[PDB]
Specification:
The structure is cut from a larger assembly and holds three copies of chain A, one copy of chain B, two copies of chain C and one copy of chain D. Chain C is mainly α. Chain C is built from six helices and no strands. Chain D contains twelve helices and nine strands. Chain D is globular and about 65 Å long. The chains are: A alpha+beta, B alpha+beta, C mainly alpha, D alpha+beta. Chain A: This is Type I-A CRISPR-associated protein Cas7/Csa2.
């Protein structure tokens, strides 16, 4: 199915998507510019942000984590079990399955049948030319416009410096000429009310892009190259991958930082068909805009199912007051 | 002579010269491009008059009718009201019109789009009758696109005016044939579009730099006894 | 114009001879849009004066010199009337620009 | 005034031929020669005779062929044989055309043939041209051999370029400096000074020759011909040739300017020279992103670019002395 | 039918229309020069401007996506299914539909009857001519001159570096000799408020270009060679194609960027007859130009319906308030 | 078997995870910026806090303390026995076992 | 209005050498003033050490500290009472506290 989610998350003390290397002093976090009103002309302010690459990688990690427990987990790439995003890089033609079996990167249907990560998240085969558009698209994580307007440019970055106590076996803290690595470096942690938006196109899973339909009985029968039970299991695993999404597993340095996460409010709509993208949470007036979008879409003849947490939305259209992410994914998998 | 004055406020040009690999674009739109756009305007405004089996013949007959009411082969002129620049662009131009190479051979190619804040277009006619004056004045507007389908275009106003025989510097584009008698910009412009010709045209553009950047400002040319006034300022023009 | 003296003091926070590498203050002083955060960053940079003093004293080379009080009021006698951010950047960026100069400190 | 006219075909190849006219005149003499730009024609005014022009041209061709014979169907690693020609066939085609021109002119015989123009002399050319409803077979564009040879002489003698191998692929950056108002012979010769032969760098440490703007900055850093760009207005037309897997194509055709960069370099190096070139080279080798930010700041007059470049350079290995900082402050004004 | 939508949109953190970087490890976003007035000065600013080629490609993608739901989606080329759209070439004289049906290229009428994508976005047959123009056109996406004036300087281009770690079987990493693929590339993300303008000539959908009208019974009725019901289905699909347009589905790098999109304001004019294009959204005074051109067109006898979102455009004109893009779509599907 | 614990704990007169001064007599405590909802709108406040690195180090200390008593506690590291948080620093390919033996680092399974 | 330098002269005695009084917490408090009341509290804490330094200045061969005049206190009160905005309050609190770390020639 097609499901779209948009909302706000309260995140603080996070060193997510740092720039400087491990050995580089003063490890710097990424920043992105945002254009805001500030009751005057459109002004640009540089604020810490989280790239969509991290969100896509963590969605992939959650998907493989929830798909390994499924009976169809054997149909997976070996690199997927290693949480590696290198899906059929440059300079190879045959890939390795989860159990070690070889797979040929020639026919898209075979690739999406024997491998599941390349199906949900797409893939690229530069040697052969085979490609698949990713069915999961993750936006950036930007602080809300109202929040950044209120803070009025107060840095929101803490550069905490820390080191190690690497010492010689004799107990002497050696210099660079001894063999120790007692170096000084810093890490940048950010804070604020961020907005998130991710879209899933699970309605096209198990469907090769070359031949989306088969037309056997002159009817629009989808070209589901895999078993329908396998497709349902993959969809359920992809939907359950959202459980660790809004829980504290969408960034790096979790061992030493483990960013503090809390979803404030959000909305999600799914109708097993084409659906307009939800407005991102970076904009302060996204609630009314999304209400208008999902009311017009429903009025246009769409069976839109809406689950809202901690928002009144429109209090007149068909919306279910979901309490948590787990309940939302349960509702999503209930309509498969 | 009823001269048609229009104002085109569109950012990017789209007409490329005889070029390959990197597609060199005209600094100013050639008369062929404007003639084709006006022919398209005639096509979708009054489709009963121009009706052909294929679009090529309809375009050819619209162009022929336009040139019939034109003063001579010397076609529409333009006046750059804004500084000009060459804005480079990268496009995925597929290559499938050649021998072999199947049909899906797409490689990145450069095709710069000349940027313009404001420009003015003057069609030179020979006193077309009133019952068609409105026809061609409406045809002057609704000029949605220029060059290829990439760069959109929009009008601002449309009018008919005489030259009032006023002396003013020639801020228009003229062939380098008669204005030879008169810091010069002359180049091949392909006045006549081809449908299965090439005249050198002068341009009021110079590459002067004021502090650091060059762009392309006005030429301040010698004055011409034939001109036309718009929004107060008077610009000279050449007519046969 | 009281720029080299403060630039050499800011250079004490970036040079490898002071193994503390105060880079956040350089970013703060460089990325200043209006009056308040520039002063906040320069205060944060100046606050680490005892750090540099005791680092150079405990290492052997002569201790760093604090910017003179004579141009301290000179800093605030000009930045006050730079209401426009555009001309304020010319000094806000230059403060960190002079923080990366050579500034030979210890032999 | 002989006032040689230059064929109006392509404002890049037109520039090459009209811009090698000057060296052809100089090698034959022709004092007091000037170039008037006509938008694209680029006419040249001088008091030379046609026979004297031919003598200068044959002198230039003799020098070029003598240079070509230094390396070896003969293929040489020179500017006009294989250093700039990305196509293998031209490596042999061009020397044959040049020696044919030499033989024809030395016998007081005007050339009576036409030849294909390579993409090197004019990137606007290529293999296919859209006529009405498709392309033309072979190479539709052809040029008379005389102007072809003249443009080749100009390209070899005047226009600087850079070749970076990096294994199987190959990048060729080509730069041509175009006057916009007026130039005399001394100005054009000063621009000719920029040209340096055999810029086939390769290696692996000098991987910064990609990012064409950075490459041209690196090339101009070590050049100290003449600060003419501060008193005369010049532009730069530059383009890249790529041979990734024998797939010859052009991927960059941006049109930047040369006055700002030369002014910046002269203002930076006016204080200190020992701490200027070493600074820039170290920053290029270590902080490539910092170098890109710095060149963006130069071309856009941006304050944050200099700070970012200095921070990135100081992060790895850049000393970034005081005098260059003072020069940057003075440039900031 | 014929509709024209011009406005200003707010998007940031995008890597749209990059220079690829196929051989260079540095990926550059589009860099464009824009001339702007600076209080008695004509300066140039280097800002990105998104080409309309990608906009048209994504509009076609949305159209082909929305045309699958309708039962009349059989009349569609198999090429359009794969987000292709080369539409033949010199050596192609046969059209293959989604079901795999041979279609001749003798006349435009049969082609547009059997193919829907070629009827909307055009096609050509160099073998026999018979060129057909695209009925949908999109302008460049560039920041408005007001935003450039307000911002003036500032980089507004963030170069973010991403690596591709690829360890060996146990844990071994390699740079250039272990045979693994480890690249550290850089992407340029842009920001700013952009301006767009698109023209959709739905009134000519299903009518051959060379025969706009029949004119057989002394009444020049439109030459609708295709079925009216599936013609209206095509109109609705093309209208709904704008839904994955003002939502963040424009450009590339969608998996890794998915730009944060929100339309700020817009003006749209819809009519059953030919109507002029209003203005490109890049101009700061484009609202006054919109009002002037609408007034002139209405004074020349044009039945124009004007829908305005987050813009006044004067109270005298009959403008209909639009809450969002879905509101405009709902208001447009009536005709 | 996976475990997730959370809760609230009160700290009084604590100086945990300080900067240590290094070159100053004033031993600063670590400060971090946190977001507070607030009735007037979201705000940011700087408060002292303890990073997760120190908590991980103390968990490691407790784990090695409770694993030394176990009979299989010999399969540890000399640095781990010395409460050293560094693991396989740069330039080293061998591990000093708690028994004094040398452990190769060419295989992760052997290491674990 | 000229009293910033006068108060900073006294503030510098709280962190300079040749005094054996390293009071950095008061400087941090007077420089991190988010509101007027805590700024005044920090000012009072700094001024409470005026006898502390004045008594021992003459005991080490140094000139007595330049204790701010009551006119400086009046000016500070006037500036504080007119600032209900933390925006300019932050820079005002930073201004005088910046003078604490300076190369004052207190003892010749």
């Amino acid at each position: 199915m097609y499901v779209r989610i948009s909302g706000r998350i309260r995140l603080n003390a996070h060193s997510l998507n740092a720039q400087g290397g491990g050995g580089t002093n003063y490890i710097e976090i990424t920043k992105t510019k945002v254009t805001v009103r500030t009751e005057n002309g459109w002004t640009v302010v540089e604020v810490p942000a989280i790239t969509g690459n991290m969100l896509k990688h963590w969605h992939f990690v959650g998907f493989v984590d929830y798909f390994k427990t499924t009976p169809y987990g054997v149909n997976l790439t070996e690199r997927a079990l290693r949480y590696n995003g290198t899906r059929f890089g440059q300079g190879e033609t045959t890939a390795t399955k989860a159990n070690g079996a070889t797979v040929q990167l020639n026919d898209e249907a075979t690739i999406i049948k024997e491998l599941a990560d390349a199906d949900v998240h797409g893939f690229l085969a530069p040697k052969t030319g085979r490609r698949r558009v990713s069915l999961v698209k993750a936006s950036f994580i930007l602080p809300t416009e109202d929040f950044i307007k209120e803070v009025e440019g107060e840095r929101l970055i803490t550069a905490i410096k820390h080191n190690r106590v690497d010492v010689d076996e004799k107990g002497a803290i050696g210099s660079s000429k001894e063999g120790t690595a007692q170096m000084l470096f810093s890490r940048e942690y950010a804070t604020g009310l961020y907005g998130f938006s991710i879209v899933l196109d699970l309605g096209l899973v198990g469907i090769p892009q070359g031949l989306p339909v088969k037309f056997e009985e002159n009817q629009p029968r989808p070209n589901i190259v895999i078993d329908p039970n396998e497709r349902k299991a993959r969809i359920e695993s992809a939907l359950k991958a959202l459980i660790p999404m809004l829980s504290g597993y969408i960034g790096a340095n979790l061992a030493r930082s483990f960013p503090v996460f809390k979803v404030e409010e959000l909305v999600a709509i799914a109708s097993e068909g084409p659906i307009p993208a939800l407005v991102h949470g970076f904009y302060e007036d996204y609630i009314e805009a999304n209400r208008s979008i999902i009311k017009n879409a429903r009025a246009l003849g769409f069976n839109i199912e809406v689950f809202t947490y901690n928002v009144d939305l429109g209090e007149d259209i068909e919306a279910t007051k979901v309490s948590s992410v787990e309940e939302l994914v349960a509702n999503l998998v209930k309509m498969v | 002579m009823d001269i048609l004055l229009v104002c085109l406020r569109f950012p990017f040009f789209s007409v490329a010269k005889r070029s390959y690999q990197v597609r060199t674009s005209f600094l100013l739109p050639p008369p062929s491009a404007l003639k084709g756009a006006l022919a398209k305007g005639l096509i979708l405004l009054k489709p009963e008059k121009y009706a052909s089996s294929s679009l090529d013949e309809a375009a050819l007959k619209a162009i022929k009718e336009i040139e019939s009411k034109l003063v001579d082969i010397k076609a529409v002129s333009v006046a750059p009201l804004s500084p000009l620049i060459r804005n480079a662009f990268l496009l995925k131009r597929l290559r499938n019109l050649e021998s072999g190479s199947n049909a899906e051979k797409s490689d990145a190619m450069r095709r710069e789009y000349t940027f313009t804040r404001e420009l003015l277009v003057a069609y030179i006619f020979k006193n077309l009758t009133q019952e068609e004056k409105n026809l061609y004045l409406k045809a002057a507007m609704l000029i949605d696109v220029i060059g290829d389908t990439e760069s959109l275009a929009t009008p601002v106003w449309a009018s008919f005016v005489k030259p009032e025989d006023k002396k003013a510097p020639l801020a228009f584009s003229a062939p380098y044939t008669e204005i030879y008698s008169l810091r010069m910009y002359i180049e091949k412009m392909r006045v006549s579009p081809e449908y299965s010709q090439e005249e050198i045209f002068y341009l009021p553009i110079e590459e002067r730099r004021y502090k650091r950047i060059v762009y392309y400002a006005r030429i301040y040319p010698p004055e011409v006894e034939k001109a036309l006034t718009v929004d107060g300022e008077v610009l000279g023009i050449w007519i046969p | 114009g009281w720029i080299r003296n403060i630039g050499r003091y800011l250079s004490y926070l970036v040079d490898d001879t002071f193994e503390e590498y105060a880079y956040d203050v350089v970013d703060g002083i460089a990325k200043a849009r209006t009056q308040e955060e520039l002063l906040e960053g320069v205060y944060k940079a100046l606050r680490l004066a005892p750090k540099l003093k005791k680092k150079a004293e405990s290492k052997g080379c002569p201790p760093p010199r604090i910017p003179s009080p004579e141009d301290i009021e000179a800093l605030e006698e000009k930045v006050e009337q730079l209401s426009n951010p555009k001309d304020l950047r010319k000094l806000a960026v230059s403060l960190a620009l002079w923080a990366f100069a050579s500034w030979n400190n210890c032999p | 005034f002989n006032e040689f006219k230059t064929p109006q075909i392509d404002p890049i190849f037109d520039l090459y031929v009209a811009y090698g006219y000057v060296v052809s005149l100089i090698r034959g003499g022709a004092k007091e020669a000037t170039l008037i730009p006509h938008g694209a024609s680029y006419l040249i005014q001088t008091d030379v005779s046609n026979e004297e022009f031919r003598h200068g041209l044959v002198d230039a061709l003799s020098s070029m062929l003598s240079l070509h014979i230094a390396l070896a169907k003969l293929v040489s690693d020179a500017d006009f044989s294989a250093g700039a020609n990305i196509n293998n066939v031209y490596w042999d085609s061009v020397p044959r055309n040049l020696e044919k021109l030499m033989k024809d002119l030395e016998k007081k015989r005007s050339v009576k043939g036409t030849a294909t123009i390579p993409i090197t002399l004019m990137p606007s050319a290529g293999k296919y041209m859209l006529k009405h409803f498709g392309v033309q077979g072979g190479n539709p564009i052809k040029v008379d051999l005389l102007n072809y040879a003249l443009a080749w002489v100009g390209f070899h003698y005047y226009t600087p370029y850079i070749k970076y191998a990096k294994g199987d692929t190959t990048w060729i950056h080509i730069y041509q400096i175009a006057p916009v108002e007026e130039v005399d012979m001394i100005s054009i010769l000063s621009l000719k000074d920029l040209k340096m032969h055999l810029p086939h760098y390769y290696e692996s440490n000098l991987d910064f020759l990609i990012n064409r703007r950075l490459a041209l900055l690196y090339h101009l850093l070590h050049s100290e011909a003449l600060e003419l760009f501060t008193e005369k207005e010049f532009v730069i037309h530059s383009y890249t040739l790529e041979r990734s897997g024998n797939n010859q194509a052009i991927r960059s055709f941006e049109e930047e300017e040369i006055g700002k960069l030369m002014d910046f370099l002269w203002k930076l190096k006016r204080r200190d020279f020992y701490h200027a070139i070493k600074f820039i080279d170290d920053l290029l080798k270590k902080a490539t992103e910092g170098a890109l930010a710095l060149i963006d700041a130069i071309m856009n007059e941006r304050l944050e670019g200099f700070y970012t470049a200095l921070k990135l350079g100081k992060k790895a290995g850049v000393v970034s002395s005081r005098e260059i900082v003072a020069a940057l402050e003075d440039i900031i004004c």
